[PDB]
């Protein structure tokens, strides 16, 4: 059935897209984490609060 | 014959990927809120983080 095949192909596109979005948001989180790690020494408590969110 | 297995398998993958995506986005939104609360601080490290959020 062509309807089923189209549905499959559509889902495939959707999977690729969601994967892209997921990696896109995760990438931001990772870069943010790295920045917080660089500033562990400094007394900037907001960064620790950002860190807590990352590990939540 | 033709198999409906693919559809159901892909649908599970879609829901699992959506969950992960929404999970990471939620954190980003939480972080955006923390930065918005500290706008007056004019913190250079926060500014860098803010730029990443909106990149």
């Amino acid at each position: 059935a062509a309807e089923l095949m189209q549905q499959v192909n559509v889902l495939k596109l959707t999977v690729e897209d969601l994967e892209k979005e997921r990696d896109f948001y995760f990438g931001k989180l990772r870069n943010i984490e790295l920045i917080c790690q660089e500033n562990e020494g400094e007394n900037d408590p907001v960064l620790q609060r950002i860190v807590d969110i990352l590990y939540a | 014959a033709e198999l409906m297995q693919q559809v159901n398998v892909l649908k599970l993958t879609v829901e699992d990927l959506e969950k992960e995506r929404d999970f990471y986005f939620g954190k980003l939104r939480n972080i955006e809120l923390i930065c918005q609360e500290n706008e007056g601080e004019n913190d250079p490290v926060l500014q860098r983080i803010v730029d990443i959020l909106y990149a």
């Binding site: 596109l13 897209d17 896109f24 | 955006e32």
Partner: peptide, 13 residues
């Protein structure tokens, strides 16, 4: 909020 909101699941299918 200036974050890129995730595309809705209603869309893309």
């Amino acid at each position: 909020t200036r974050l890129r909101p995730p595309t809705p699941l209603s869309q893309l299918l």
